[PDB]
């Protein structure tokens, strides 16, 4: 119930809280995939962000989330340090760029 500062019963949910919910579950590991899908993989959405901004704010704890041992993900061509600095593309399940329930996460670009 993200609901804002002082506010409660005032008429619905996700009407006048000013938020969502979203999952990630899609593709970016093969051993720690459930470190960012089931470790933590539920955000909240604002009323007002863009698909871009859910790639700065979720990507982030994907990457203390996915830092057991990086010494092993670099020797197997995974790079920790590029989470950061890389591209997030949220995908939807029709295959667009949007924030429903549940977004998918790909690497690739939307078509641009």
Same mark, same amino acid.
């Given at each position: 119930?993200?609901?804002?500062? &002082? $506010?409660?019963?005032?008429?619905? /949910?996700? !009407?006048?809280?000013?938020?969502?919910?979203?999952?990630?579950?899609?593709? %970016?590991?093969?051993?720690?995939?459930?470190?960012?899908?089931?470790?933590?993989?539920?955000?909240?959405?604002?009323?007002?962000?863009? &698909? $871009?901004?859910?790639?700065?704010? /979720?990507? !982030?704890?994907?990457?203390?989330?996915?830092?057991?041992?990086?010494?092993? %993900?670099?020797?197997?061509?995974?790079?920790?340090?590029?989470?950061?600095?890389?591209?997030?593309?949220?995908?939807?399940?029709?295959?667009?760029?949007?924030?429903?329930?549940?977004?998918?996460?790909?690497?690739?670009?939307?078509?641009?």
């Amino acid at each position: 119930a993200p609901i804002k500062g &002082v $506010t409660f019963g005032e008429d619905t /949910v996700w !009407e006048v809280q000013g938020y969502k919910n979203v999952r990630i579950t899609f593709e %970016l590991d093969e051993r720690v995939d459930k470190v960012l899908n089931e470790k933590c993989s539920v955000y909240t959405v604002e009323s007002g962000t863009e &698909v $871009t901004e859910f790639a700065c704010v /979720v990507a !982030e704890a994907v990457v203390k989330t996915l830092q057991p041992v990086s010494d092993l %993900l670099t020797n197997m061509g995974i790079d920790l340090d590029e989470w950061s600095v890389a591209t997030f593309y949220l995908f939807d399940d029709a295959g667009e760029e949007n924030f429903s329930s549940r977004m998918y996460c790909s690497f690739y670009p939307p078509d641009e």
